[PDB]
């Protein structure tokens, strides 16, 4: 509905019901909004073909314990009665005003026996000045290192449109880790560090459609026109009917001879 | 992550009391709160259900309109207000938090990851 | 809603099939997320219960993989691979799908 995919991860007030679900078919539309704060995910698409066949996502705590500096990240627009911020993340802002952020160094290793998957954001702010007084003054630099990811990045505080009543944008980077491999963040600051790392549960197929769900057909793929529910071998709906079903064609229709070819008296 | 407790005692049936949990390590003013009580000897059971800004407050069915629960996200507390108790209320009390971020999924009663060490209150007749 | 339990204390040795069943009044799974509501914690003798799987499935990283829920509409079920001298405790079933939380009555297990 008014939840987005990769909302399920981030956890904007629009993804509360459904972010720890479990489904073999997951629906988005298109008033879905992935973001409360204003923001964008870094190679989207890869991500979103991940969640869609993640057969739901569990959530386990990463047990990051910050002491001495303030953690409970609070914004106008990500909101429901009072100001907050998202679900499985926690801004990490100064501890009361203009600051020294202590270079904070977090590992978390993925015990499990499945890849879990790994969000993370960096904060743009407004301006400069905004980000002195959330973060403190000095070249922020966060690095993010594991066996197979090892990419880092410098947060560019600056004057963006006003998006959603907020002016900074937080780029939600991510990556997967594999079983008994660990990764560590290093950040000094202008950090919306993960506070559970998500889970793939099993095999589903997502879709993106805008029509009401049912319950009332064994169909086959879906698509944003609704369902294709045919024994046929072609279809002249939707090109992009995800699932096993007939393959589009460009006729109208075809007509396959059944009786023999008949002449009229 | 843990959550540190205070009022345990013994009391008189009737009486008013007040019990405290505190917390530390987390961010309070997110997670949801839950009381609940176990009897020595007895199986487990719920006592109350605070969201993370307190406006909406669920009971158990034997202590509705009796107790009442209260937090306060700036003093990083959790009290919960005795008032009218009788002999059966002699349990130990815990103060688990609920897994949730902040109150998401279609209830807001949670489950309980981590708990409290517990407070045992006894009556004396 | 009443949560309640299986049968009582087993007298189960070291390495069994450790089986406790949880029965429903109602149904708690839900058809919006599809999570199945409910929880399972463990409680030692004078330490405080907690938590082993939530969502009846999703297994916590303190825990081994020996504990295994199995979840359904109504019945729910733990199964513990092997027992060792750290699994003694005592059991609940605990649903969140609609107030009140009902707690189950408590399934010990004998070594």
């Known amino acids: 509905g008014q939840c987005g995919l990769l909302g399920t991860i981030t956890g904007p007030p629009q993804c509360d019901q459904f972010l720890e679900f479990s489904a073999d078919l997951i629906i988005e539309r298109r008033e879905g909004s992935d973001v409360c704060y204003p923001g964008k995910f870094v190679n989207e698409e890869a991500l979103r073909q991940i969640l869609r066949e993640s057969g739901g996502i569990d959530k386990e705590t990463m047990g990051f314990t910050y002491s001495g500096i303030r953690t409970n990240g609070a914004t106008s627009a990500c909101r429901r009665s009072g100001s907050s911020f998202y679900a499985e993340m926690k801004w990490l802002l100064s501890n009361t005003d203009n600051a020294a952020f202590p270079q904070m160094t977090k590992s978390y290793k993925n015990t499990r026996r499945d890849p879990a998957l790994i969000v993370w954001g960096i904060h743009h702010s407004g301006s400069t000045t905004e980000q002195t007084k959330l973060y403190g003054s000095g070249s922020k630099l966060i690095t993010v290192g594991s066996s197979n990811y090892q990419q880092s990045f410098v947060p560019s505080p600056g004057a963006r449109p006003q998006v959603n009543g907020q002016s900074g944008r937080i780029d939600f980077h991510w990556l997967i880790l594999n079983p008994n491999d660990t990764v560590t963040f290093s950040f000094n600051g202008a950090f919306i560090a993960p506070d559970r790392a998500s889970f793939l549960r099993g095999k589903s197929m997502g879709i993106q459609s805008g029509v009401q769900v049912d319950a009332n057909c064994e169909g086959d793929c879906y698509h944003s026109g609704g369902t294709i529910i045919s024994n046929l071998p072609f279809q002249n709906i939707n090109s992009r009917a995800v699932g096993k079903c007939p393959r589009y064609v460009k006729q109208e229709s075809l007509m396959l001879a059944t009786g023999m070819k008949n002449v009229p008296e | 992550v843990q959550l540190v407790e205070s009022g345990g005692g013994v009391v008189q049936p009737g009486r008013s009391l007040r019990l405290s949990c505190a917390a530390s390590?987390?961010?309070?003013?997110?997670?949801?709160l839950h009381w609940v009580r176990q009897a020595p000897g007895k199986g487990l059971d719920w006592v109350a259900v605070?969201?993370?800004?307190?406006?909406?407050?669920y009971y158990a069915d034997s202590v509705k309109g009796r107790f009442t629960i209260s937090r306060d996200n700036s003093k990083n507390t959790l009290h919960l207000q005795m008032n009218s108790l009788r002999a059966e209320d002699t349990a130990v009390y815990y103060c688990?938090?609920?897994?949730?971020?902040?109150?998401?999924?279609?209830?807001?009663?949670?489950?309980?990851?981590?708990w409290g060490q517990g407070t045992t209150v006894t009556v004396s007749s | 809603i009443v949560m309640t339990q299986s049968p009582d204390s087993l007298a189960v040795s070291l390495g069994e099939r450790a089986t406790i069943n949880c029965k429903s009044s109602?149904?708690?799974?839900?058809?919006?997320?599809?999570?199945?509501?409910l929880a399972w914690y463990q409680q030692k003798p004078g330490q405080p219960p907690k938590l082993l799987i939530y969502?009846?499935?999703t297994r916590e990283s303190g825990v081994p993989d020996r504990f295994t829920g199995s979840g359904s509409g109504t019945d729910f079920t733990l199964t513990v691979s092997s027992l060792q001298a750290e699994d003694v405790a005592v059991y609940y079933c605990?649903?969140?799908?609609?107030?009140?939380?009902?707690f189950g009555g408590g399934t010990k297990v004998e070594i």
């Open positions: 688990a938090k609920g897994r949730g971020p902040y109150c998401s999924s279609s209830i807001c009663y949670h489950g309980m990851d981590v």
């Open positions: 390590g987390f961010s309070f003013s997110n997670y949801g």
């Open positions: 605070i969201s993370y800004d307190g406006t909406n407050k």
């Open positions: 109602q149904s708690v799974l839900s058809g919006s997320i599809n999570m199945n509501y």
């Open positions: 969502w009846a499935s």
């Open positions: 605990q649903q969140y799908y609609s107030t009140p939380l009902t």
